[PDB]
Design a protein around this ligand. Structure first.
Ligand SMILES: N#C/C=C/c1cc(Cl)cc(Oc2ccccc2OCCn2ccc(=O)[nH]c2=O)c1
Lengths: 548, 415
């Protein structure tokens, strides 16, 4: 009977509401007689108390059975009460990443039993936790109860328990500032650079302090020894890695299985370098049916094979040392996928990761690199509380040119060039002024929304004219098609004039790749050309730019 | 400290709950700074620690005071603001002196500290809750709520308004021609005086406020009479080419959405044949006349363009390169209440984000001086980049609303 003299947290019901009145008759005698046995023992420990039924409230009470049925378990569904209770501060949204942890000579894991039931509940609120054990048929008086402590499944239990635990740790951490205590759910994680004897002494001291407040801690040694398996991680003394990943072999794949696969691969990508989720997730583009069987493509199976080959041998991450520099290194994988490693040491990685661009039809390598740098900067700020020095496969000239002529304001911190290919470069640049001694192509295209036929053509200043017919197209596609035609039929230096703000917009963005084959062909042509000047004029204003 | 009166009761709009907003991850530096600042603030009774029973949260950041080497805590109250102050734009709402923009010099003073001597309504304190974050989510954040009128909250100057009026009353008597307007934590003081006279008068107001108990760590002059809607400029060229006339006709055709009395036809007839872009085309009489007509019509402002107080202000910014940025403050499309161009020192000091930040601050301040409220920005920057780096160069005590734009403007050089 570990009663707790802990200051309770004042709790209210959402304004306008009241306690849950839900009534429960059913069902079986066995479950009832099983409930009495537990309730009497809980009352003896002061966790619950019988109440005279003066206009009280009620909550459903079930009883279930774990494996190894020698021990019964009582269950209470607080859903209806949880609806009516006030909101509380979020407990912990995210979890600490092992790459951000710092080396400690000794680490101990302490799990507290009866965590919630050892923390008292606000008095005036207790009446809302009222519940009833049913009599055996015969409409006889039942056994009323209410919680004097934090009920399991109640909305406010985790946060209140967390704060209570914090206030309990408060006087202990004051006498031992050299030791660091982390708090996660029902677990405490202690660590120190103190010698093993002094460390274990301090651990036992902490256990005693906790036991004085009514919080139990494991008697035999202290519980587990490294690993340390935690939240899908393997934490060793000198290293961290991920729990073993299993990629299943199947003759047929479904949206669910592909979801699990992409999930596992993503999870593994934080440490094992090179993981590519692009094709496999591209299979998942259809959002319609979850049980639908999806055939794998060749690129997908190739990608998955490369992932298996990567996952063949195990790899490990190291821990963080504040005294040493934080370095980030990025490499392009070529498919629009980027991979990165964050390290304080050449052969030791703190962690790794990947950036892929899902949004947008068209883009270029420099922009994607910038976005990657952004992602890594955010991640680094979150985990280590600072930003890394960057090693990037891009020349300063390329970068500077790009951000100087870019319409949008980007930024990158101090970075150094790495000569490791593939390097990031600008494959082509449009002329900023018209070219003297170059043929001027006036291009246009059009389409019928219904028939989807359309056509694309050009008329030049040398009197050269062409019209190429199209099928299954759109106005935009013909507008790009015309420019493509002009690129095909001209020399090494060409002046193109378009009526399309669309096409102009796509081209002026200077993409080095696209998910449209046409745009890719146009890109190839622009690369092959020595000089290209693209210009725009108002459509249907009839100057030099008329239809076809 | 003492309670001069009881606490002014603060209610929100019925049906609206308190603000719940995530706390952005911060550098260890800024975290430690906030920890020091809040330790001292807790020591002075300004803020107190709270439990799990307070669900609400408001973001907090660490910036530099102005140029100062000491850290300053900047709370982002925009959400709580939107919740309470739209009622407090009504009940306690401070009137805006439209004659402020006419003055030849306007100085901005920081009166914020004044709010710290006044207690806050006991029931309202739970909505001021903020969280100092921990690195790598290792510990739950440190949680405080304000016991006194918080800086950045628009309700604060609204409550302190009477005291401010009282303290200012003697100064306004000896200086009837000086305009004084209080926006949040700042006091805007206009005058037609010479710069020397103006600065001496500002110092007079500083010593006046100081001897009356208000500390102003101002220990920054605008000129709103020169602020207007900039004219659209057509390129001045000796000769012309086909390309130049194309850019001209295009730009004018774009301007037709603004000034409908523009005709591009005679310029269109001059390019009639299919020609090389580099071919020089001399202007005719029927052309040049039209160019002059379109030039003289572009220097006169728009007709039927007025400020709607029921509509929010929108500020668009576009990057012109070489440390230049152009902006337009409007309400409805193509009707421009204000236009301008911000510039800075070129090279080895400022980068893109810094320039954009200072531009946003300048525009916001102008908007405050003119319409008495801040515009919602459309920012030419990546969301996460801005969200990461905006607190570096930010010297302002308020935060304007913003969003982020893609699909680059082809307007660009046209403006
Ligand atoms: N189950 C379970 C345990 C989970 C667990 C979760 C977290 Cl967030 C931290 C943790 O260990 C630490 C506790 C206090 C300070 C630092 C720590 O880690 C420092 C790094 N480290 C990890 C393992 C090891 O043996 N040595 C070592 O130095 C353990």
């Amino acid at each position: 009977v570990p009663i707790s003299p802990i200051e309770t947290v004042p709790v209210k019901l959402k304004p306008g509401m009241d306690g849950p009145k839900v009534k429960q008759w059913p069902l079986t005698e066995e479950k009832i007689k099983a409930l009495v046995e537990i309730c009497t023992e809980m009352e003896k420990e002061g966790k619950i108390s019988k109440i005279g039924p003066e206009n009280p409230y009620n909550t459903p009470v079930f009883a279930i059975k774990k494996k190894d049925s020698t021990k019964w378990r009582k269950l209470v569904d607080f859903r209806e009460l949880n609806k009516r209770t006030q909101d509380f501060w979020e407990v912990q949204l995210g979890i600490p990443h092992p790459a951000g942890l710092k080396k400690k000579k000794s680490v101990t894991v302490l799990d507290v039993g009866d965590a919630y039931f050892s923390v008292p509940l606000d008095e005036d609120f207790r009446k809302y936790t009222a519940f009833t054990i049913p009599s055996i048929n015969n409409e006889t008086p039942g056994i009323r109860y209410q919680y004097n402590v934090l009920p399991q499944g109640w909305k406010g239990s985790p946060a209140i328990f967390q704060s209570s635990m914090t206030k309990i740790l408060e006087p202990f951490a004051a006498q031992n500032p050299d030791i660091v205590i982390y708090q996660y759910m029902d677990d405490l994680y202690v660590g120190s650079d103190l010698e093993i004897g002094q460390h274990r002494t301090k651990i036992e001291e902490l256990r005693q302090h906790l036991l004085r407040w009514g919080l139990t801690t494991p008697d035999k040694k202290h519980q587990k020894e490294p690993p340390f398996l935690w939240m899908g991680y393997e934490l060793h003394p000198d290293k961290w890695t991920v729990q073993p990943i299993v990629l299943p072999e199947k003759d047929s794949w479904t949206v669910n299985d592909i979801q699990k696969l992409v999930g596992k691969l993503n999870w593994a990508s934080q440490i094992y370098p090179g993981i590519k989720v692009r094709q496999l997730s591209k299979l998942l583009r259809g959002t319609k049916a979850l049980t639908e069987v999806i055939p794998l493509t060749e690129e997908a199976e190739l990608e998955l094979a490369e992932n298996r080959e990567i996952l063949k041998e195990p790899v490990h991450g190291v821990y963080y040392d504040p005294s040493k520099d934080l370095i980030a290194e990025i490499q392009k994988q070529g498919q629009g996928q980027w991979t990165y490693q964050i390290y304080q040491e050449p052969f030791k990685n703190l962690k790794t990761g990947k950036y892929a661009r899902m949004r947008g039809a068209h883009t270029n390598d420099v922009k994607q690199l910038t976005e990657a740098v952004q992602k890594i900067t955010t991640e680094s700020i979150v985990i280590w509380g600072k930003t890394p020095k960057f090693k990037l496969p891009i020349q300063k000239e390329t970068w500077e040119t790009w951000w100087t002529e870019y319409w949008q304001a980007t930024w990158i911190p101090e970075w150094e060039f790495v000569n490791t290919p593939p390097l990031v470069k600008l494959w082509y640049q449009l002329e900023k002024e018209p070219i003297v001694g170059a043929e001027t192509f006036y291009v246009d295209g059009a389409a019928n929304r219904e028939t989807k036929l359309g056509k694309a053509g050009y008329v030049t200043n040398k009197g050269r004219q062409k019209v190429v017919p199209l099928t299954n197209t759109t106005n935009q596609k013909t507008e790009l098609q015309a420019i493509y035609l002009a690129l095909q039929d001209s020399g090494l230096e060409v002046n193109i004039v378009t009526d399309s703000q669309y096409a102009l917009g796509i081209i002026q963005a200077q993409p080095d790749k696209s998910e449209s084959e046409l745009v890719n062909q146009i890109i190839e042509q622009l690369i092959k050309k020595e000089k290209v000047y693209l210009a725009w004029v108002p459509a249907h204003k009839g100057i030099g730019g008329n239809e076809q | 400290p003492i309670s001069p009166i009881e606490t002014v009761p603060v209610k929100l709009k019925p049906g609206m709950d308190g603000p719940k907003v995530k706390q952005w991850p911060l550098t260890e530096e800024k975290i430690k700074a906030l920890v020091e600042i809040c330790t001292e603030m807790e020591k002075e009774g300004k803020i107190s620690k709270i439990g799990p029973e307070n669900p609400y949260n408001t973001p907090v950041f660490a910036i530099k005071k102005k140029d100062s080497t000491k850290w300053r805590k900047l709370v982002d109250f925009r959400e709580l603001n939107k919740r309470t102050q739209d009622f407090w734009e009504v009940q306690l709402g401070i009137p805006h002196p439209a004659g402020l923009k006419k003055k030849k010099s306007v100085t901005v003073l920081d009166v914020g500290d004044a709010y710290f001597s006044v207690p806050l309504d006991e029931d309202f304190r739970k909505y001021t809750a903020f969280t100092i974050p921990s690195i790598n989510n290792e510990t739950p954040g440190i949680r405080y709520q304000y016991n006194v009128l918080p800086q950045g909250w628009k309700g604060s100057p609204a409550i302190f308004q009477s005291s401010m009026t009282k303290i200012l009353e003697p100064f306004k008597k000896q200086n009837p021609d000086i305009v004084i307007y209080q926006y949040m934590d700042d006091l805007y003081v206009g005058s037609d005086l010479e710069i020397g006279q103006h600065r001496t008068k500002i110092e007079e107001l500083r010593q006046h406020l100081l001897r009356w108990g208000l500390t102003t760590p101002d220990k920054y002059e605008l000129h709103p009479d020169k602020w207007t809607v900039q004219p659209i400029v057509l390129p001045e060229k000796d000769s012309w080419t086909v390309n130049d006339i194309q850019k001209l006709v295009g730009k004018l055709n774009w301007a037709s959405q603004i000034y409908p009395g523009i005709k591009v036809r005679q310029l269109s007839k001059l390019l009639r044949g299919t020609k090389a872009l580099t071919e020089v085309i001399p202007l005719t009489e029927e052309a040049e006349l039209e160019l002059a007509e379109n030039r003289e019509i572009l220097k006169e402002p728009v007709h039927g363009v007025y400020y709607d107080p029921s509509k929010d202000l929108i500020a668009e910014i576009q990057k012109q390169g070489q440390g230049q940025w152009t902006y337009q403050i409007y309400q409805e499309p193509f009707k421009n209440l204000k236009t301008g161009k911000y510039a800075r020192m070129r090279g080895a000091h400022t980068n893109d984000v810094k320039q954009l930040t200072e531009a946003v601050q300048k525009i916001t301040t102008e908007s405050i001086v003119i319409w008495g409220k801040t515009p919602k920005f459309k920012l030419p920057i990546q969301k996460e980049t801005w969200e990461t780096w905006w607190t570096e160069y930010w010297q302002a005590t308020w935060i304007p609303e913003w969003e982020f734009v893609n699909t680059p403007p082809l307007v660009k050089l046209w403006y």
